[PDB]
Amino acid sequence: ALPGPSQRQLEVYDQCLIGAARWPDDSSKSNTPENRAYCQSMYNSIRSAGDEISRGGITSFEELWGRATEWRLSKLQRGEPLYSAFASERTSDTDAVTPLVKPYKSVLARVVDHEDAHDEIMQDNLFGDLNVKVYRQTAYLHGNVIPLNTFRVATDTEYLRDRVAHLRTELGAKALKQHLQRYNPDRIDHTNASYLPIIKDHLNDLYRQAISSDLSQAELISLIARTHWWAASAMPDQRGSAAKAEFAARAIASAHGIELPPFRNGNVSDIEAMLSGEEEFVEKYRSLLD
């Protein structure tokens, strides 16, 4: 038995920020209607899942993820085409790339200015050799250090500005876009699906620890961050993993009566997780909040 959701709640203002994607750049997404509702609901469901966790109703990360997923699928517009992707685990031969474009363009800077980014040369069938700033996210798992997400940000701006206009016309928009869907010089090549089994087992191990009844506040926050970190960086599902990961992290916190405030504006949790190392993330977790 754990405390369960606290009696004292966040302000309704903050409840409408829980689960929001507050990109530092674009900030015209407070469309109260949908978004503020979505957030409020995520906030309620998180406390509910927390309550189930404190009562043994949820007994594994896998189950919490399941709860987060059904909550997430419920916010989809009816007849939504991506519905299946939101309900499905990523597989080897399933999309694994995210072209760094809007609303992700603020990523580019962070990769380039990344204390841990390194200059690399990329071989491209369309642009040729490109200088790319590269951040390879890695994780420690039982002694095996594995590659999670890899960020690429082409650094030869001018040259690219040209070539693309060139190629767009020389090959036509459709072709070029299809190509950039996977090989956009500015992209995130995500965690290989083949690592999802051990990562999920790891997540279940983190969960089991996290529901301990004698954890200091320090240990607890650390476990929540790590869980948040692994779920988000792993991007277990074809769609909505970021929402599911935040959902899970906060439910676990709520199980202990911790009422986590929303992430700071400009602070998009999963991106912050993907851009960091696990220990770094754990250390900066609190500062990413309220």
UniProtKB/Swiss-Prot annotation:
Record's keyword terms, sorted: Secreted, Virulence
Annotated GO CC locations: extracellular region
Pfam families: AvrB_AvrC (PF05394)
Source species, domain of life: Bacteria
Zinc listed as a keyword: no
Locations listed in the record: Secreted
Protein family per UniProt: To avirulence C protein of the same strain.
Protein name, UniProt field: Avirulence protein B
Organism, scientific name: Pseudomonas savastanoi pv. glycinea (Pseudomonas syringae pv. glycinea)
Gene: avrB
